[PDB]
Homo-oligomer: A and B are copies of this chain.
Amino acid sequence: NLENKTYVIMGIANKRSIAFGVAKVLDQLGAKLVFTYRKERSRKELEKLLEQLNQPEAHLYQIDVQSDEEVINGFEQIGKDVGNIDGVYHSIAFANMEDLRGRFSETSREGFLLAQDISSYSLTIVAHEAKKLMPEGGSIVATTYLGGEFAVQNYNVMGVAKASLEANVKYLALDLGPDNIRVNAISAGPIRTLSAKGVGGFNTILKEIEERAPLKRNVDQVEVGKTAAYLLSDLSSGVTGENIHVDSGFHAIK
């Protein structure tokens, strides 16, 4: 039960967004929710998706995580508007189609560094700024994918960016640990989202989960959200630097 908890959720773009799954779960358990977005188009969808939630107040903030000024000023606004928070759900990644849909060995330097900037660095800076709003401690969760642990066809530059993110989670847990701030990841199975449309062969992946994973079915955004809720609450006290695979057991087999 999360009444009188406030969580910031970053990276809802639409109703299929994994972080909207997180939102519905957290809202149902009584949280106050603050949302951040990048595109105009995404603020519009958030305003519409808010009608399905129980939030009596719309707390929306533009934060493009490529800009230090925007993350710093964003979290500062959030602190002035709603006070201290209890956690952040990070659901942000990006890479070019142009590098994604090409050999990994042909990835461009700007492509590679772009994906690292948005998909991994962004957590470090978010954590630094959110830490300011968690003087009593709290919890930070980022969304990763199995392709950060193993080479997966076509995930390419994004696999390297998730490996980097997963380590970022471990170094931040060590660092922020003494401040009672836990940092973890959920390694989500494949889910039809907007971003999923730029992974070559996504449908083939989806079906192979169905055929092969222990549970013989894919997961959805709400199941990510239910585990998010575990990690962001005191239930997962004593759990930090961890990666939870929410993926039908797929990670455990070969």
Task: List the interface of chain A (C-beta within 8 A of B).
Answer: 68, 103-107, 109, 112-113, 116-117, 120-121, 124-125, 127-128, 131, 146-153, 156, 159-164, 166-168, 170-178, 180, 182, 189, 213-216, 219-220, 223-224, 226-227, 229-230, 234-242, 244-254
Contact = CB atoms under 8 A, between A and B. Distances in A.
Contacts of A149: 167, 254
A254 to B, nearest CB: 4
User: Which among A107, A156, A239 has the highest number of chain B CB atoms within 10 Å?
Assistant: A239
B177 A249 contact: yes
Nearest to A146: B254
9 shortest A-B CB distances, which residue pairs? A241-B252, A177-B214, A163-B167, A150-B254, A223-B238, A240-B249, A219-B238, A151-B174, A151-B170
A241 B249 contact: yes
Contacts of A238: 189, 215, 219-220, 223-224, 226-227, 246-248
B164 A116 contact: yes
B180 A167 contact: no
Contacts of A147: 254
A84 B88 CA distance: 39
A148 B165 CA distance: 11
A240 B252 contact: yes
Contact of A239 (B103, B117, B178, B227): B227
9 contacts: A104-B174, A120-B164, A146-B254, A151-B254, A164-B164, A224-B238, A238-B246, A241-B253, A242-B252
